[model samples]
Target chain A: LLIGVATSSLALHAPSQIVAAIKSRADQLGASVVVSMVERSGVEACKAAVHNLLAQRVSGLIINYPLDDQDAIAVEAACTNVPALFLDVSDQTPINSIIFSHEDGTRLGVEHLVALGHQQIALLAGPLSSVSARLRLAGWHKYLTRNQIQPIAEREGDWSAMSGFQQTMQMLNEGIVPTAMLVANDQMALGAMRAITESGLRVGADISVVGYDDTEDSSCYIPPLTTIKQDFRLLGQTSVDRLLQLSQGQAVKGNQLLPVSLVKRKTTL
Target chain B: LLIGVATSSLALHAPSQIVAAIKSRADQLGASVVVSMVERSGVEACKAAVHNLLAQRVSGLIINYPLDDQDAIAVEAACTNVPALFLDVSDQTPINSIIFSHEDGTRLGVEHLVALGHQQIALLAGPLSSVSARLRLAGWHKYLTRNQIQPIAEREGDWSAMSGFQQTMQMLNEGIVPTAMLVANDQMALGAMRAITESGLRVGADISVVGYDDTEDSSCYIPPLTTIKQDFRLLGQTSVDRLLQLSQGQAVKGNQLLPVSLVKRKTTL
Candidate 1:
């Protein structure tokens, strides 16, 4: 039997895909799984959730969401010799983790924009505190700088549609409109598109947009959306495999990176 | 401590909102919960997940997704004196449940369309096997019949965008187009809109579309969506409260329905 510390962001912040895949993969091995859903309200609250899991007679533990530095210390210290795996990464914890190549995923979106003969591309990134969000910004900056193209502008969003819309609107109000926009996620892209259309410009004609996550609604966008699809299923399956291996007294990689792909839709030229 | 049999449809089929809410409410009560995610491929598979939860030392049990009649038999018969609660409903089991007023919710959408002077309305219903889906269809039919307005057409969808798209397209091809369409869920409405646009009809101008669930992406639909919103959080909290009362030998209602409301957007005129 296994126990998972599932964070409350199963819909937008993280993904329900990972949780579903983790259970299915463990099921394939004929193992019982118990998931613990914890709110990200505070550090103490998170640590308490993990602490409760330790009370169960589970074979292993999984932190479904990435942990903070202090949270990692408490988690790693609380369960000694427990087969625990973090879904993504943590700053202070040197534990087994399954993370995606966020930087590379962002690059795929930018590469498509660059290939489309567009140099004035703007970036709408997520909160910079998140490592994945920080990496995406880094990727966008690096890719544009390497191509010797001066980026038009960059804005931050909290992965909300309204934030993307407001950020894009701010850029436009200041007469800093770009030929293309790269949004962090599908939801934000929706807001960004509204701001673009509200400014009396066509999405596919006057300006193209690319989004990450390739969410189900992305393709249903007015002109559709070009996006990066992260294989959360692969990451989920791998985490279970690695965790089981670790429990069986086997060695596995310290950090494993799953690949992300680009889905070219109608939004990209 | 509690155990939950969480079906795999945390995002689309079922609201991840409920799952997240269930955990958070339990967290508020200082109770530890273990959620079990299962695949609905077969009856045996569902029974097995509940069986596995029984193997754990949990105070109560929760099935995050609705249950089938046979599935409910196994779940109820498998555990005696267990405080078990189903998220929505089950046909056979007379157990505690938390469900939404799907009929009333659909009525709100239909009432809106009727008030908009659209007597030639169509329906994009979900598969009738589900009690919830059946109730929505009933709501649409009953409201139109009572109002002495004939519903032009009705088609079944599997609650997918493509299903809604195909159903609408089929209606169009058969020369049975309606002035307004009421889809079962927001996702289906997306496809319905695409099909409408493909048929040279604008969403808000030529015809109006109303959807259910008012999901996160529904508001971001091209012209936005005038849909019904179910209070999953209230249902989640009520389920936990009722389950606790059951465990304490307290009296509670047989079946509880939380109210649903209409969210007006640009989809309907």
Candidate 2:
């Protein structure tokens, strides 16, 4: 059977790795894979990709939908009559999906930083419109309140290094310095480090930093970024596994949540 | 008119940026863009993407052809009776194309290092099979020879952070350390920095690094990577401009070469 794999933003390391794993697992199962990338994460683009894959007569479809797409239901309906699996959509989906434990992941970073004696902790959040970002923000709030570490500052980046850099620079210009920062992703974490260094501060010693999404490049960041490891490969494999099971008339429950772990690196002093 | 853009891999920041620019520019010109990605740089995949784009009756095609594909000519021929604009393809191609001045870009990094009083320099080169990688390598050799400096060491990575980290680790384990390293791309440069730090060497102080492709994330790297910058936005704009020119029956000359410059950041001490 042909499997349709639709993902948003192949430019990011996480989506790319998940797609790679999906293709590899499909190949081993003697199944064909047709992949599509919607870089803009627009509903129309996502819908078009799903329709194109359906036109290829794929037996099942896996999509990484836009986190806050208003027309998500339309996109799901477009894949009607086929076994569908989504990546990181809301939990109340009518179809099957796999969501990341992003909130817990964010908390993991905060707890690590707090334990390291950091009081002035800031957050470099992803786009607020993103579901993942909102959940991560919730996690940060929960942990910060529990530890009674008053939120020092908050900035929003669009999950790009440039945004991270710009936000961090803005924070510096405003004379707001945090002893630690919990960035939403590895790419932004890289940007934050650059800003910190450019502002005459050292990354690991002067200020601690933690990034989520243990992207392949995360380990290569200077001082080796301390990050939350999301098992993208496992996520990919499981998404396919569930889709295949559904294809075989197997019953599955609500969206599955994958576990994440904290990877200690030099970025966190 | 509908323009088709076929690129090798979207996982890398370079290609993705180029594709995005091309699409945006084309849309502004009231032209439709159809894009396809060959996740792996296989001849079959490239050929398939080209065929699919051609089937859509694209008025013109822009392709980032696989440098090592033996059947590149066959793939080029498939666009017969249509205007084709190749990206980073060989100079001898009959079609209109664009190539990056990678050698000059590499030279920019090399000259910067030389001026910084670094003589013991090594190279973190990309896979030698790629045409772009080969051109960049030639630049490294030319500059080193001109400066009368013997190359200290050389290692190959597949333009990924992981490979860069592994190569640097291997080099360190073998007791080879250069005062400066010219990495092929920014991603690998990120890995090289991690390796340097993991080995108890301070990046930008004890060792200097230079990366190519000044990716979006490059500047946000700790110490803000000093690297070569390719005008990806301009590359995309130029490709579309040429394709549009071709579509309008206008004659264009040899493969256009875009200029690249060195971005001085904190990575070079």
Candidate 3:
């Protein structure tokens, strides 16, 4: 059977790693896989990718970042009787997804930083428009409030290394220098580290840094990076396993929330 | 008509950007584009991806990597009558390619370093198995010889940030520190920047750096990388344009070489 995997931005390490893991699972299962990259223009482009995959008569489909609720429902309807699985999607009507527990991950980062004698913390968040980003922000607020510590500064990045660098530069320019910064992802953390060093500050010593998504390059980022680790390989395997079960007419229940853990590296105090 | 693009490592920015550009071009031309990521397991997996694309009955195919001569010739013969376009490949039989001037790009980097009053310049190269890496190394050798300058240290990375970090760290541990480093790609350069900073040496002041493939994030890299900008978007557009020409029985002969330019950023002194 042919299983279609639609993802946004294969250039990003996380999405590409997930796709690779899914392809590996599909290969082991003796199934064919068709991959598509969803254009970032708008929701319509993503819908078109889903439609194209459905038109290919795929028995099951796995999508990363399924636009919006209506779009997800439309994708499910277009698939007719085929099973649909999503990753980190907020929509629940059409198909169940593997939620990434972004909140817990960020909360853990905050707790770790606070426990390490860091009171004045700043946040380098992703786009607030994204569901995961909002969750991460919420976690940051929750843990900071729990510790009775207010965030000194916060900036939103586009989840890019460049954005992280630019935002951090802006923050430093404005004289908002926190003792520690919790970045949303590793790419941004990489940028944040650069900005810190360029501004005559040490990454792990002068200003502790923590990032989400312990990507492959995180461990090698000079002093390394203390970050969250989303087990993408397990997520891919579980999603594929669930899709296969649904394809066999098995009843899939509630959405799965994959666990994320803290990977303590040298970036933290 | 459907055109296929088979590329290596969608995780990297360069190949993914090229694929996106090709797909955009195909959509503008009112054609369908099928993209496949060739597994890096070995040459067989790459050949399999090519064969899979061909099996889809694609009118034309653009492959970022066409593998070795035996594999390329086999892929061409398997195509039967379809036109195939390659990028930076050596073999040509019923298929043509666009070659990036990697040698000239590296040569330009070396010349820039030498002219900047720097004598000890080192090389952080990609895997020698890759044609691009070999050409880049040759450029380093040629330019260093021309200027009567011997490289202080050289190491090969796997075209990754981690490899760059590891290799640079190794060089530093051996007390072989160069005044300037010319890295093969921007990702590795990013890591090298971190390594330099962690070692208490400034990027631009203490040690200058130059990178190849001025990727999207290169300009935003802490000190802003001085790099060789490969016009991948134009390369993608040209490759697709040539494929369409060949599909229409238009003669497209000889190897096309795209030009590279130096982007002087803050990384260089």
Candidate 4:
């Protein structure tokens, strides 16, 4: 059977990792995968890609990008094919998605921080535009509110090491020297660490830091990074399995949330 | 017209970056791209992907991974399609390839270090199995030999920050302190910088480090890595142009080499 994988921003490590796992599993199951990558911000371009795949008679389809509420309805209508599953969150429609455990993942790191007796904790979140970023931020707020612990400070980063560095430096410049903090991702954490040391403070001792996404290089960071790890592989396999089941008339409703865990290293107290 | 793009290791930032550029350009030109990805090191799997794409009637093909002598013959045989241009080096046959400017890139970084009055520079090369890595290593050797300089130390990293860290730490443990060094990639340079700092030696003033691939986070590196920048977008654009040219019977004689530039940053002595 032919399966269609439509995605944008294939330049990123995230999307490519998901696609690679999907391709490997599909190959083992004796299926042909036809990937159609479009421009990231091209709405019409995304629809064109889906329509083209449908014309090629793909038996199943997987869209690996998040769609806004406005764009969701139009693209969902344009997915004029059989079995399909989306790998992102959308509120405009009932889309089959692999639930990403983002909120709980941040909580896991926060829990570890609490266990270490950290009362003052700041957060460096990703761009607020993304639903996943919002989820992580909301979870952090909820946990702190329930525990009656006030968040000392928070800022948003564009998910770049440079942005992390700039934001951390900004905080330090303003004399917001937090005792502990959680960064959205590892690269940002790397930059955060740089800003800390440049300001005459040790990362794991003077100030505890936690980063999400235990990427390949996280463990190699000068003091190593304490971060959350998400299983993108299972997400890929689950998407493939769910799509094939839908093709066979076993369609399900609601988004599936994937779980995340924390890896403790020298970055945390 | 449909163009088939076959690549392995879709999980990497490198291949995906190239593919994203290819897809974007092809979309602008009104060409459909059918991407078929296979697992890295899966020889038979790669051939199957190529054959499947050929069956879908693609007018041209771009293979984006390097090939060994034995596998090259088998894959070329299975290509079975017209206007194919490989994006890697192979010595098996007279293959059309987009020449990468790896050697010259390292040399440019070396020249910078030398211009800064440094002679005893070490080298941190990528895995020797990769032709690109070998080209970089050979170029470094040639430059040092020509300058009548003795190489202080050298090591191979698996293009990871951890490997670079371990390698550099090993050199230090062996009492080999380099005045300056060139790493194969920005990630390695980052790890190298970490090792340098952790060993109580400063990065920029004590031991200058130059890395290749001015990756997004490279500039945000603690000392901001000085590096060589290769135009991956241009490489992608040129490959498509060459493939289309070959499709219209505009076959050229030799491989086209891309150039690289040096970004002078904080990590230079």
* Model 1: per-residue Cα lDDT over B50-81, one tens digit each: 66666666788777544665666566677657
Look at candidate 2 and tell me the lDDT of residue B91.
Answer: 60
Off by over 4 Å in 3: A28-30, A91-94, B91-94, B198-200
Candidate lDDT scores, in order, read 0.73, 0.78, 0.78, 0.78
The local distance difference test score of model 1 is 0.73
lDDT of 1 at B218: 68
Q: For residues B1-269, what per-residue lDDT tens digits would candidate 4 score against the true structure?
A: 67888886776456677788787777668878888886666568678788778877888898876665566657767777487777766433466777567667867876777789997798999887666677788888887777777779988987778888989888989888889998988888878998998889988899899988776667777778889887778777888878877888877745777888998888887
lDDT of 2 at B41: 57
lDDT of 3 by residue, A1-269 (tens): 67788887665667777877787777777676667777663567766777766766678888786355666666666656678887856634346677787667867898798889998898999787555677788778888998898899988998888887889878999889899999988888878988898889977898888988887667766578899999877877898888888889886755787778999988888
RMSD of candidate 2 to the truth, in angstroms, is 3.4
By TM-score, who's the top model here? Answer: 3
Ranking by TM-score: 3, 1, 4, 2
Q: Write the per-residue lDDT of candidate 1 for residues A1-269, one digit (tens) a residue.
A: 56554453554634666676677778788776766666754556556767666766678887765455566666667656788777645423466667777767877877888889898898899777554677777878888888788878888987767787778878999988799998887778888887887788888677788888876555666667788887666766787888888898897847776788998887767
Give every collision pair in model 2. none
Instruction: Write down the worst ten-residue block by lDDT for model 1 chain B.
Output: B5-14
Q: Identify the superior model by lDDT, candidate 1 or candidate 3.
A: 3
Interface Cα RMSD of candidate 2: 3.4
* Model 4 per-residue lDDT at A7: 82
